[PDB]
């Protein structure tokens, strides 16, 4: 029993965090094999960031301009290239702590753990989801750039996010490990705003199944709905459209609890139109959308890494 | 910006998790130097849990009765002793991944990260607080016994909790790393119930200061209160009595935001009276009590 926002054990990722310094800027890097990956804006000054020409700023740099530190050991940079918004520093030493890894690009609604770092030193781990507006509601201070997001699948660390910036609303923007930003964001000091956010419907339903598994059933009702009628209601409440793929992915949870996906949709429909009425679900007065159906199954089954 | 329930990086603790097997029972152990620490109920069977005699059950065991598995390597047990409710298995190999550590006993209201494990394999990490009723609202399934709670401060891992049991309400009970249970609990199948839980007042106040640091002030009011009047109102909402020690600990946050501790207490009193009226504080519709004043200063 118990339901917590649980992150993957960060250990395999901690052994990859390094500190990258270019001039006066100090951020984090991810050391995998003989390459250190970090945001390309590490080469920018505050004046350069206003209108950066990264090929021009990078051509002016040499290997010894990049100070890389793995704990208390300085790594020597022997090459440097740029792939989209990520700077790839070739180093002379291969990271002996390199885990089995893959670079994956996640879709909005997908969750991941973030290992927040400052000066190549991990300070905390938390779980979060890629919002439908492509931002993450993270917890980041200055120096956190280069901190990464990941999932652990068996023994393989799938790196899915690298932190680059904070938007004026306090939400965060970053890229996959190939340097492609999530969302309509650019790495420059300019007017960028997150779009209007929506609630991840499939995740709220998954969390409602986790509440039923934990003995919270007050919200269940005798009613069912059609997938189209639910989506007309969901669109009204800024909820993401629930697709047939979402209904299929919720199948194991539906079979485990005996509550059909469209039966759970009618509970959500009533919660949206009437509220919780002073009640909580899993100790929460809001409908939680940062647990995917797989997170619910993994946490309510006991999968280890 | 942003405020999240953040756990400590679990890496230093992951390198200590081992699997301990005694007969048919399999739970987790914490391998530090040449000692593996695990709940003493690993030696218990079916007709044992009701009224076990651990000295009697342990005297019947030998070193080779304990199978310890660190990853895919079986560790050889060369000694075994009991310290309160923890079984201490002396092993022939010192853990090369042993971090700088200390065993600390925490007080209710204090927070820590839990590295949930099954079969000596870490599956997840989460943050939580020692409730005023000495239980933890964890997320634990069968086989999680021996999973530990910890804090990391200045490269040192302070081990503060070892999971022992789940109470009938779904909350969890465990011990410090010296085997002393938190609360009036025992490692027996006897009728054990958690006492009435209360909200950690000092933590709600700390979280209200974190909201002011992140730019939220909607809940503040022109009022102040006396410490005694606040406690008379707090008791009516099942809130822990706020002590002068709590008021002192909130001093740095009070000075940073410019909001006196008893002024923030007046906002809490009002928030308890009115609720949030459709608003949220740090993305939450409830008053959060699992962030200590120290966590707020650390994260903000
Ligand atoms: N009688 C008795 C007795 C006494 C002790 Cl000290 C421990 C246990 C096992 C026990 O409750 N551990 C488990 C730990 N955490 C979550 C659990 C969720 C389902 C099932 C078991 C869980 C039973
Ligand atoms: Cl009220």
Swiss-Prot record, chain A:
Q: Describe the reaction catalysed, as an equation.
A: TSAVLQ-|-SGFRK-NH2 and SGVTFQ-|-GKFKK the two peptides corresponding to the two self-cleavage sites of the SARS 3C-like proteinase are the two most reactive peptide substrates. The enzyme exhibits a strong preference for substrates containing Gln at P1 position and Leu at P2 position
Crosslink Glycyl lysine isopeptide (Lys-Gly) (interchain with G-Cter in ubiquitin) sits at which residues?
5, 90
Topological region Cytoplasmic: 1-305
> Known consequence of changing residue 49 to A?
Does not affect ability to cleave and inactivate human TRMT1
Query: Which positions fall inside the Peptidase C30 domain?
Result: 1-305
Localization recorded for this chain is: Host cytoplasm; Host Golgi apparatus; Host nucleus
Activity control note: Inhibited by pyridone-containing alpha-ketoamides compounds 13a and 13b. In turn, alpha-ketoamide 13b (tert-butyl (1-((S)-1-(((S)-4-(benzylamino)-3,4-dioxo-1-((S)-2-oxopyrrolidin-3-yl)butan-2-yl)amino)-3-cyclopropyl-1-oxopropan-2-yl)-2-oxo-1,2-dihydropyridin-3-yl)carbamate) inhibits SARS-CoV-2 replication in human lung cells. Inhibited ex vivo by michael acceptor inhibitor N3. Inhibited ex vivo by compound 11a and 11b.
Residues annotated as the enzyme's active site: 41, 145
Q: What is the effect of changing residue 142 to A?
A: Does not affect ability to cleave and inactivate human TRMT1
- Subunit details: 3CL-PRO exists as monomer and homodimer. Only the homodimer shows catalytic activity. Interacts with host FBXO22; this interaction promotes the proteasomal degradation of nsp5.
Q: What does this protein do?
A: Cleaves the C-terminus of replicase polyprotein at 11 sites. Recognizes substrates containing the core sequence [ILMVF]-Q-|-[SGACN]. Cleaves and inactivates human TRMT1, preventing tRNA guanine(26)-dimethylation of tRNAs. May cleave human NLRP1 in lung epithelial cells, thereby activating the NLRP1 inflammasome pathway. May cleave human GSDMD, triggering alternative GSDME-mediated epithelial cell death upon activation of the NLRP1 inflammasome, which may enhance the release interleukins 1B, 6, 16 and 18. Also able to bind an ADP-ribose-1''-phosphate (ADRP).
Q: What is this protein called?
A: 3C-like proteinase nsp5
Which species is this UniProt entry from?
Answer: Severe acute respiratory syndrome coronavirus 2 (2019-nCoV)
Q: Which gene encodes it?
A: rep
Q: Which residues of the full protein are shown?
A: 3264 to 3568 of 7096
Curated annotation (Swiss-Prot), chain B:
Task: Relate the assembly described in the record.
Answer: 3CL-PRO exists as monomer and homodimer. Only the homodimer shows catalytic activity. Interacts with host FBXO22; this interaction promotes the proteasomal degradation of nsp5.
Briefly describe activity regulation.
Answer: Inhibited by pyridone-containing alpha-ketoamides compounds 13a and 13b. In turn, alpha-ketoamide 13b (tert-butyl (1-((S)-1-(((S)-4-(benzylamino)-3,4-dioxo-1-((S)-2-oxopyrrolidin-3-yl)butan-2-yl)amino)-3-cyclopropyl-1-oxopropan-2-yl)-2-oxo-1,2-dihydropyridin-3-yl)carbamate) inhibits SARS-CoV-2 replication in human lung cells. Inhibited ex vivo by michael acceptor inhibitor N3. Inhibited ex vivo by compound 11a and 11b.
**Annotated effect of mutating residue 90 to R:** In strain: Beta/B.1.351
* Cytoplasmic membrane side: 1-300
Q: Give start and end of each Peptidase C30 domain.
A: 1-300
Protein name, please?
3C-like proteinase nsp5
- For the cross-link Glycyl lysine isopeptide (Lys-Gly) (interchain with G-Cter in ubiquitin), list the residue numbers: 5, 90
Reaction(s) catalyzed by this protein? Answer: TSAVLQ-|-SGFRK-NH2 and SGVTFQ-|-GKFKK the two peptides corresponding to the two self-cleavage sites of the SARS 3C-like proteinase are the two most reactive peptide substrates. The enzyme exhibits a strong preference for substrates containing Gln at P1 position and Leu at P2 position
Q: What is the effect of changing residue 132 to H?
A: In strain: Omicron/BA.1, Omicron/BA.2, Omicron/BA.2.12.1, Omicron/BA.2.75, Omicron/BA.4, Omicron/BA.5, Omicron/BQ.1.1, Omicron/XBB.1.5, Omicron/EG.5.1
Subcellular location(s): the record lists: Host cytoplasm; Host Golgi apparatus; Host nucleus
According to its UniProt record, which residues of this chain constitute the active site?
41 (for 3cl-pro activity), 145 (nucleophile)
Tell me what the record says results from residue 189 to A: Does not affect ability to cleave and inactivate human TRMT1
The record's function comment reads:
Cleaves the C-terminus of replicase polyprotein at 11 sites. Recognizes substrates containing the core sequence [ILMVF]-Q-|-[SGACN]. Cleaves and inactivates human TRMT1, preventing tRNA guanine(26)-dimethylation of tRNAs. May cleave human NLRP1 in lung epithelial cells, thereby activating the NLRP1 inflammasome pathway. May cleave human GSDMD, triggering alternative GSDME-mediated epithelial cell death upon activation of the NLRP1 inflammasome, which may enhance the release interleukins 1B, 6, 16 and 18. Also able to bind an ADP-ribose-1''-phosphate (ADRP).
């Amino acid at each position: 029993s118990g339901f917590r926002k649980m992150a993957f054990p960060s250990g395999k990722v901690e052994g990859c965090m390094v500190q990258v310094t270019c001039g006066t800027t100090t951020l984090n890097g991810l050391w995998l094999d003989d390459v250190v990956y970090c945001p390309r804006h590490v080469i920018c000054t505050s004046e350069d960031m206003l209108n950066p020409n990264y090929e021009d700023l990078l051509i002016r740099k040499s290997n010894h301009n990049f100070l890389v530190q793995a704990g208390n050991v300085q790594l020597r940079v022997i090459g440097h290239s740029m792939q989209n918004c990520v700077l790839k520093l070739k180093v002379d030493t291969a990271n002996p702590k390199t885990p089995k890894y893959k670079f994956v690009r996640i879709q909005p609604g997908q969750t991941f753990s973030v290992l927040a770092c400052y000066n190549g030193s991990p300070s905390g781990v938390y779980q979060c989801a890629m919002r439908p507006n492509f931002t993450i509601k993270g917890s980041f201070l200055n120096g956190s750039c280069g901190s990464v997001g990941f999932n652990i699948d068996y023994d393989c660390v799938s790196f899915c996010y690298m932190h680059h910036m904070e938007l004026p609303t306090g939400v965060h923007a970053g890229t996959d490990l190939e340097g492609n930003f999530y969302g309509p964001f650019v790495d420059r000091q300019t007017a960028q705003a997150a779009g209007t956010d929506t609630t991840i419907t499939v995740n709220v339903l998954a969390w409602l199944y986790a509440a039923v598994i934990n003995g919270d059933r007050w919200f269940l009702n005798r009613f069912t709905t059609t997938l189209n009628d639910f989506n007309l209601v969901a669109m009204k409440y800024n909820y993401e459209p629930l697709t047939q793929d979402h209904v299929d992915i919720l199948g194991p949870l539906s079979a485990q609890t005996g509550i059909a996906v469209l039966d759970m949709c009618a509970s959500l429909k009533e919660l949206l139109q009437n509220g919780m009425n002073g009640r909580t679900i899993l100790g929460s007065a809001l409908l939680e959308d940062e647990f995917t159906p797989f997170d619910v199954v993994r946490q309510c089954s006991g999968v280890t890494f």
